[PDB]
Amino acid sequence: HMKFPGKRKSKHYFPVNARDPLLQQFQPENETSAAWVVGIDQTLVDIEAKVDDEFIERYGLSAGHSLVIEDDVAEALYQELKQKNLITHQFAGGTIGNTMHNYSVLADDRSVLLGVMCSNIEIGSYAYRYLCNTSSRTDLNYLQGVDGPIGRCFTLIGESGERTFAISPGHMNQLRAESIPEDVIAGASALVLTSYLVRCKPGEPMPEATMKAIEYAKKYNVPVVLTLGTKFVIAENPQWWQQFLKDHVSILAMNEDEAEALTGESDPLLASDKALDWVDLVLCTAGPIGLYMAGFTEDEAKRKTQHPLLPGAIAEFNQYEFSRAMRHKDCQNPLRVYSHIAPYMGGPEKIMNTNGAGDGALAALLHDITANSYHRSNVPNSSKHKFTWLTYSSLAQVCKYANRVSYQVLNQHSPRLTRGLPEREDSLEESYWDR
Amino acid sequence: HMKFPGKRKSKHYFPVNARDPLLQQFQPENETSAAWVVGIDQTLVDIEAKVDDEFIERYGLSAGHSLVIEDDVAEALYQELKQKNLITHQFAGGTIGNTMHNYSVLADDRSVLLGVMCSNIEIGSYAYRYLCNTSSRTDLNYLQGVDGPIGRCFTLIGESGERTFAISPGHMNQLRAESIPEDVIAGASALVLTSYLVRCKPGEPMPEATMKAIEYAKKYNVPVVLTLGTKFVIAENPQWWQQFLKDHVSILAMNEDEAEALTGESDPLLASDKALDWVDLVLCTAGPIGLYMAGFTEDEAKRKTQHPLLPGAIAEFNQYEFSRAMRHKDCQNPLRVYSHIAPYMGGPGAGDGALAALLHDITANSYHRSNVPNSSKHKFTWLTYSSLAQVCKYANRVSYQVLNQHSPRLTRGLPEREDSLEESYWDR
Amino acid sequence: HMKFPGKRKSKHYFPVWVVGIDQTLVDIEAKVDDEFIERYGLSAGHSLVIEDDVAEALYQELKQKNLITHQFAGGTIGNTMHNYSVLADDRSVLLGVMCSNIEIGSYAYRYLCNTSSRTDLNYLQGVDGPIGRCFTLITFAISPGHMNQLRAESIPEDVIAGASALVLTSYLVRCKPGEPMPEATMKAIEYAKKYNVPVVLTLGTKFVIAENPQWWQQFLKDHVSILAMNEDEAEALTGESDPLLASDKALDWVDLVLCTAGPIGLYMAGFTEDEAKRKTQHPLLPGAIAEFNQYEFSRAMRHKDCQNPLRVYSHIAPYMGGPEKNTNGAGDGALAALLHDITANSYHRSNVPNSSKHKFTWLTYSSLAQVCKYANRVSYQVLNQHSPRLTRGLPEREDSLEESYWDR
Amino acid sequence: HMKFPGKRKSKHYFPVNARDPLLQQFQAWVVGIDQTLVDIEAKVDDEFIERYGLSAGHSLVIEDDVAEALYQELKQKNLITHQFAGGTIGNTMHNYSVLADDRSVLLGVMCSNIEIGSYAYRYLCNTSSRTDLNYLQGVDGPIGRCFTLIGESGERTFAISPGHMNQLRAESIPEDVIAGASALVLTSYLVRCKPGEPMPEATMKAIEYAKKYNVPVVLTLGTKFVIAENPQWWQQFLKDHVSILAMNEDEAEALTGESDPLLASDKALDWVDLVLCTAGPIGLYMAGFTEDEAKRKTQHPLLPGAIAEFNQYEFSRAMRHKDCQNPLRVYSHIAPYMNTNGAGDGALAALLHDITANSYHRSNVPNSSKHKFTWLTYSSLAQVCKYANRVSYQVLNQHSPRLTRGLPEREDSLEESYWDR
Numbered sequence A: 001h002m003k004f005p006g007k008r009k010s011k012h013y014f015p016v017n018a019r020d021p022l023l024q025q026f027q028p029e030n031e032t033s034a035a036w037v038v039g040i041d042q043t044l045v046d047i048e049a050k051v052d053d054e055f056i057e058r059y060g061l062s063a064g065h066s067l068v069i070e071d072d073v074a075e076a077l078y079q080e081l082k083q084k085n086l087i088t089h090q091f092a093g094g095t096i097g098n099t100m101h102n103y104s105v106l107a108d109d110r111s112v113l114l115g116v117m118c119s120n121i122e123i124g125s126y127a128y129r130y131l132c133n134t135s136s137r138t139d140l141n142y143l144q145g146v147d148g149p150i151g152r153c154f155t156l157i158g159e160s161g162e163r164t165f166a167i168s169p170g171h172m173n174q175l176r177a178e179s180i181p182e183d184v185i186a187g188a189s190a191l192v193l194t195s196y197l198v199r200c201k202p203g204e205p206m207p208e209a210t211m212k213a214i215e216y217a218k219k220y221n222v223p224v225v226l227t228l229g230t231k232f233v234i235a236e237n238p239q240w241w242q243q244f245l246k247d248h249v250s251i252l253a254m255n256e257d258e259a260e261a262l263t264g265e266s267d268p269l270l271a272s273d274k275a276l277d278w279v280d281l282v283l284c285t286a287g288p289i290g291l292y293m294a295g296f297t298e299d300e301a302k303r304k305t306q307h308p309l310l311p312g313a314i315a316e317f318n319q320y321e322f323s324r325a326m327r328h329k330d331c332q333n334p335l336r337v338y339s340h341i342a343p344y345m346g347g348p349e350k351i352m353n354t355n356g357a358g359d360g361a362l363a364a365l366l367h368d369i370t371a372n373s374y375h376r377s378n379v380p381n382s383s384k385h386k387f388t389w390l391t392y393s394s395l396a397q398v399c400k401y402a403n404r405v406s407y408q409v410l411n412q413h414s415p416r417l418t419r420g421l422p423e424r425e426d427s428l429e430e431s432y433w434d435r
Numbered sequence B: 001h002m003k004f005p006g007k008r009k010s011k012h013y014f015p016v017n018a019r020d021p022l023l024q025q026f027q028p029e030n031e032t033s034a035a036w037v038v039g040i041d042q043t044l045v046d047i048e049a050k051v052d053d054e055f056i057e058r059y060g061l062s063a064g065h066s067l068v069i070e071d072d073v074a075e076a077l078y079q080e081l082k083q084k085n086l087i088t089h090q091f092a093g094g095t096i097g098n099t100m101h102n103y104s105v106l107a108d109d110r111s112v113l114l115g116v117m118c119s120n121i122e123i124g125s126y127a128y129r130y131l132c133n134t135s136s137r138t139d140l141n142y143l144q145g146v147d148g149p150i151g152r153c154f155t156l157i158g159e160s161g162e163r164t165f166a167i168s169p170g171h172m173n174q175l176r177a178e179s180i181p182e183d184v185i186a187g188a189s190a191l192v193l194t195s196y197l198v199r200c201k202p203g204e205p206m207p208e209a210t211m212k213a214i215e216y217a218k219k220y221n222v223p224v225v226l227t228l229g230t231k232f233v234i235a236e237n238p239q240w241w242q243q244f245l246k247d248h249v250s251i252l253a254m255n256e257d258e259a260e261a262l263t264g265e266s267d268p269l270l271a272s273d274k275a276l277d278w279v280d281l282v283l284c285t286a287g288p289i290g291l292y293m294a295g296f297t298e299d300e301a302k303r304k305t306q307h308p309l310l311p312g313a314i315a316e317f318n319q320y321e322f323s324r325a326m327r328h329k330d331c332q333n334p335l336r337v338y339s340h341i342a343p344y345m346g347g348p349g350a351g352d353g354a355l356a357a358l359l360h361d362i363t364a365n366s367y368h369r370s371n372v373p374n375s376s377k378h379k380f381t382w383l384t385y386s387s388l389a390q391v392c393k394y395a396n397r398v399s400y401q402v403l404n405q406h407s408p409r410l411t412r413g414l415p416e417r418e419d420s421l422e423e424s425y426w427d428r
Numbered sequence C: 001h002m003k004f005p006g007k008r009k010s011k012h013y014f015p016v017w018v019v020g021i022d023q024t025l026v027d028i029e030a031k032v033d034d035e036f037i038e039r040y041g042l043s044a045g046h047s048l049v050i051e052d053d054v055a056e057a058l059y060q061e062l063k064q065k066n067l068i069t070h071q072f073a074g075g076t077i078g079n080t081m082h083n084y085s086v087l088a089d090d091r092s093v094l095l096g097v098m099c100s101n102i103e104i105g106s107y108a109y110r111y112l113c114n115t116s117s118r119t120d121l122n123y124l125q126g127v128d129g130p131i132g133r134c135f136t137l138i139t140f141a142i143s144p145g146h147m148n149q150l151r152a153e154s155i156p157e158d159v160i161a162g163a164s165a166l167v168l169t170s171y172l173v174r175c176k177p178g179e180p181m182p183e184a185t186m187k188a189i190e191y192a193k194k195y196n197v198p199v200v201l202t203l204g205t206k207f208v209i210a211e212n213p214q215w216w217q218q219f220l221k222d223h224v225s226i227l228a229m230n231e232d233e234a235e236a237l238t239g240e241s242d243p244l245l246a247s248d249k250a251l252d253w254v255d256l257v258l259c260t261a262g263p264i265g266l267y268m269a270g271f272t273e274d275e276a277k278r279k280t281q282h283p284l285l286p287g288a289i290a291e292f293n294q295y296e297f298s299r300a301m302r303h304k305d306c307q308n309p310l311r312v313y314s315h316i317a318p319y320m321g322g323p324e325k326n327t328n329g330a331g332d333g334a335l336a337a338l339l340h341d342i343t344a345n346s347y348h349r350s351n352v353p354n355s356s357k358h359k360f361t362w363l364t365y366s367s368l369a370q371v372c373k374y375a376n377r378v379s380y381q382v383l384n385q386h387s388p389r390l391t392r393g394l395p396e397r398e399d400s401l402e403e404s405y406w407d408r
Numbered sequence D: 001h002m003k004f005p006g007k008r009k010s011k012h013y014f015p016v017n018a019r020d021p022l023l024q025q026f027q028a029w030v031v032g033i034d035q036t037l038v039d040i041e042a043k044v045d046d047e048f049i050e051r052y053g054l055s056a057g058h059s060l061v062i063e064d065d066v067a068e069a070l071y072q073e074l075k076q077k078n079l080i081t082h083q084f085a086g087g088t089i090g091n092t093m094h095n096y097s098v099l100a101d102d103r104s105v106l107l108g109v110m111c112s113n114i115e116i117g118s119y120a121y122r123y124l125c126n127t128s129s130r131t132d133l134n135y136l137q138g139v140d141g142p143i144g145r146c147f148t149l150i151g152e153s154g155e156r157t158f159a160i161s162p163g164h165m166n167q168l169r170a171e172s173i174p175e176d177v178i179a180g181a182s183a184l185v186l187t188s189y190l191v192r193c194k195p196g197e198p199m200p201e202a203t204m205k206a207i208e209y210a211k212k213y214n215v216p217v218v219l220t221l222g223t224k225f226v227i228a229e230n231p232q233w234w235q236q237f238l239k240d241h242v243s244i245l246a247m248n249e250d251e252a253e254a255l256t257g258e259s260d261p262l263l264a265s266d267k268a269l270d271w272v273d274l275v276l277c278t279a280g281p282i283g284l285y286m287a288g289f290t291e292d293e294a295k296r297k298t299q300h301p302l303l304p305g306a307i308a309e310f311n312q313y314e315f316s317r318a319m320r321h322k323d324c325q326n327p328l329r330v331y332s333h334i335a336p337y338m339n340t341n342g343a344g345d346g347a348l349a350a351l352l353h354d355i356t357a358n359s360y361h362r363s364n365v366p367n368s369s370k371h372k373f374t375w376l377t378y379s380s381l382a383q384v385c386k387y388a389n390r391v392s393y394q395v396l397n398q399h400s401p402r403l404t405r406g407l408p409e410r411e412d413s414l415e416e417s418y419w420d421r
Ligand SMILES: Nc1nc2c(ncn2[C@@H]2O[C@H](COP(=O)(O)OP(=O)(O)O)[C@@H](OP(=O)(O)OP(=O)(O)O)[C@H]2O)c(=O)[nH]1
Pocket: A009, A010, A011, A012, A013, A303, A321, A322, A323, A383, A384, A392, A393, A394, A396, A397, A400, B427, B428
């Protein structure tokens, strides 16, 4: 029942749901299908508000950071916002919670979320709000119970632009590795993680559970995906993250600042290319520069672009933009391919939410990767396969999609979407509304 | 931040978001505020499964009904479904929960639901599921706590497409009149009820709270909306329902059979017309016949159709198809107007979907009036933003969407219009 | 030999001048610290005059440490006439001052080597002093020199008589008293009324206008027919913070209004014959004036020439979502586009009396909506480049032969 | 901030404004010498031509008093129709900047005191904006006047009143300006001067710098008569100094002796590295050198000619004989698209654009496939002919030999819908 990733005209027909006539005389009586995506996150609740730069330093914060805070310092901040009646919005959050939420909206298929949740949920609470607000098709039944509160992210915006985060973890890192459902990760087409998962008070089991999901991920050949949580967290130990990506990660989500922190390259293109030594596919959100994508394709199946060749540190880096991504392991003679797209319709008027924008362009990519798993099980004999790809569409096309989604997330306050993209009406549908 | 009702090319520009530059020169120093819709329901959870028509009779059920059952009968049925591993789908339900859910998906604005909810919610439970599944923009913060379980609706399919429903109410009818948020209903553009709300064990407060919600609705001149839950519920006392509609209800949703039970008219058009004696606007879903709509417009502002004139018991009833609906009270020379549309693309809970579309159009008028009071769309105090012909176009398309899927709840709105610039972008 | 205004496909066939007054200026650009501004008694966002010796002190600090980045011709009306000639490929006459003896490498030298070719400077007036120096600090610091010494005898009556518009800036009355520039300006306006030449006015900062808003209003009624403006300059003139309303209130005094609303886009308001109304095919927009673009598609007339005048409005948003990163010279560019369209009407009427585009005494060649389209595009061009002066017109679409020729 | 040469769809992306966010994350002009001249155009009788010792189709110097008599009769009878800046190289530097929207430096003379309304004033108000005249030299005399005398037939006779136009001194040649250039442009008229005037000496000092810093030298011709006086000296000039030769069909027959344009250009290729000849209505030919390893063969039919199938490798980029390791001779010709004097002066500007474009794209895009070797032109000979042919067509549909309207660029898919909105 999954939607098509993007709005481009496709050469091959996409079924959308298995009840399709041609597909019904086609599929077997016993049909599995049902392709999904799973991620791990620190169950969080955003509490957004604008504040003075005085409010920032008064609580030991720095602009543009994501800093954890002590429990007593947080209650002091919580009380000052209710006193001054400064709170503007309360909604679900989490770099990966947002991503799973946006995935379900874009594809209208299920996503499983792994994390924590109050064992007893009272109405009107932060844990309650998290549920009423989470997307419908996002599945929260596999969460784990905790006797404490879920996490609170005090998103402080201040003057136009930089959005500061202050985290009251609560029990958000109390996820145990026994709570990782083996069967869910096996039938997944990607496992999505964020750099914030290692940031925890020592001894908390979240990292223990995260590595356990990766165990299952490797068992069943499920790509591991990683998004990053600010430049400062990474620059502390760049070589540790580098070593981590080689062993486990297969897909890397990133922005230009987070990337230079990892590679030492002020050029996103080079940072992304240097990253390809460690992972199979890289997405780099460069803010106003646009976004880049770098990955691998089979050298025999390369498709050369029809756009002008772009200049860059790597000459003509989009030369095979129209190739689809494969995992390095699945290639016989892997070839590096790169692509870049500029902001949609010249970008927004207002800078707005640049933090959750990257977390959204990622969801677009996940959609395309799931779509490949979905269309492969429903139409296996298709020209779209018998080569073992990673993405259903080409890098150029996936950029086209993810770029359009980021524009959606930037042009609104929240980082979570509630409405998918508008698809084209055919002639019949068009005349219907015009009649 | 509300979406536009339908996908038609509009003469007047719809702001969509109160942040629109053209609207901030227009907008005062303080927020202009969006509108919303509220409804009351028996918090329910659908539990779908196929069974024999033999299985139906084994629990005192009839094909095609919606029947309550006692707790011992319910625990036996639940155990038999888990035993044979027969359950196929579990999701949120309720005639009005669905409608409020679909409204939020279609409009992308907030909807308030009033009802019950376990005060202690354990993970994996039914009360848990209700939350994880309800749409985001549907607001459940105003539900009421209960020491019991929410309702379970066992949807049983009879192989021919027949849907039998077996209801284990639990505490779903325990909504108290104090729990009705007065301020929520005041800023609403409609209060939505379902005929199922009167079905409860004696002494339970649900009816008391219902009368209390309607009380607030009249305070602030909020239209009351009523959808019906089967012909059988109405045939019990059709003249009682008639009396209810005159006093309270302003908008009536129905299907052809539900209507015949209420008015005695096997012709939907005639039944709807008779219904207009009691309410201000009528939506009647006639299945494969299509769906009809009947309402009032000011005889001064009538806009005559440009489509061919249709034959029916009411001669040339679509003559003013293109008029907008008003409430009878707001009209000085009220005029009856009718419209009819056939199924989308020849045909393949649907009625509860076409209603949601109507709610959207009514909220859109409330939204566009607060953001652009100067526009030609408000020389008078209308009920719908669009014309009956246009509202039917929308509701018909939505019911088709609910038919082509299994569940009665939508998960994604309709495909929106792609302009020329977007097209070139994707085709690049 | 004039170009077509815009790149839109035209129903009527185009076969293929304007005069203005300015304080002859030369831009000298440099970026500086916010400390540098207060160190010389300046304020941000102004155009503040400075003395000749104080000007020499600022000039010298820029030469020592070499902070000057770019030097080019300037002046709100110098830019506008310059950009007009680039866009239309027709002549524009500029009136002002100029060193009577010009040495190679000088500032007066540069102004000539840099001014557009098709722009005609022969009617300038000689002065034994220097032209003006504008020190652009990223605020403007002005060393007037002799820029305001234009004498009214130097106003060529015959030039303005055969013109289709006279273009002025509010900066022409801002001068040390006793300098003759304002007198020369009034003489041009006197000539303009004789031969029925529309008067055009762009404004030079909110501060200049807010001092005595009620006076400028009266100026526009008597003389002005076309008003160029930005959103701030507009609130100062009318007291209406809404650009739509401000532009509307200004229509009480003038015949046509162009208001650059920065990121909001740009508005336009004018008059058209109620018989010749052409109603828009775009959605009706909301605003303080309901459905104000209802007749976006009418052509512009002067209030006097209408028998049943009707007010008509249009609004368009920034091109391609605005730029990536010079919000000043843009308005001075958007204006040039309007001039281009107005010249085209007098041009297309004099070369093609048989065409249907002259059924009435029009002001604009195109529709109000179509003109906004054109001016909007030019503003984007002025924003993407550094200087406020254009160097190449817009690219026009070629036929199939050009397509096939270049690809072959 | 330079424009792209031509309107063809390019395989490689052209940065245009060096701001372009692309090249910035990993982060060029042409100079010429001319006799400062002013065109004064007018229609005249065939009696008017002979009356001052002139012949139709020449560019003839005249005495100062012979000029004063001619000037006075044109004002008396009110015969002058247009007055504008001129000079075979003045046109070129002007037209280049119009087409490329980048700077061009011009070297010459100019009144040290310029009064309003004068000819020196007019020259500046009229010169292209982006043309830089700051490096000119001051002179205590009047600038040159070229009286363009046209007849009803169309013959454009030229009468030159040199004044001090040939007083350019070799010290006034800016050493560094020519160094960072991509071409040094000269005209056959620079050696033609009254004896003792230093103008030819200044030319040789500019050429010194050109070879010093490896700047290709360019040469355009005036009329066939200018060369037929001494064809063998011009030839000898080309070998040592010139790297690029500009020519038209008649000017060429006088230098090479070939009534066939193709052979003449080929003969000239022995002395210089690249030759362009304007063949009037026959079209235009181009000949040069390319690396034999990277030659790219045409997709057009092979043409018959004095050299059979001369367009066999039309699509190659041109190199200098010196820069080639194994040079190959390459030829191309294009016919007219869809003022016979100034049109050729325009096509030269077009080629300069492409040659600078290579210099511009090389400094901004060192990594591209377009700079493996050390090329001369950015585009292919077939593509370069397209451009210059297109420019010459514009020069004919207008009066003056200087342009005011560069080429109109192709409207995009996105833009076109905007203008259609
Ligand atoms: N315009 C455009 N096209 C893209 C882009 N990315 C990939 N393509 C094209 O899609 C074609 C492959 O179609 P599929 O990807 O197999 O089918 P799909 O329509 O379901 O995606 C490729 O062409 P091909 O098969 O090599 O050539 P052909 O056989 O389609 O002629 C490739 O050139 C893009 O960003 N823009």
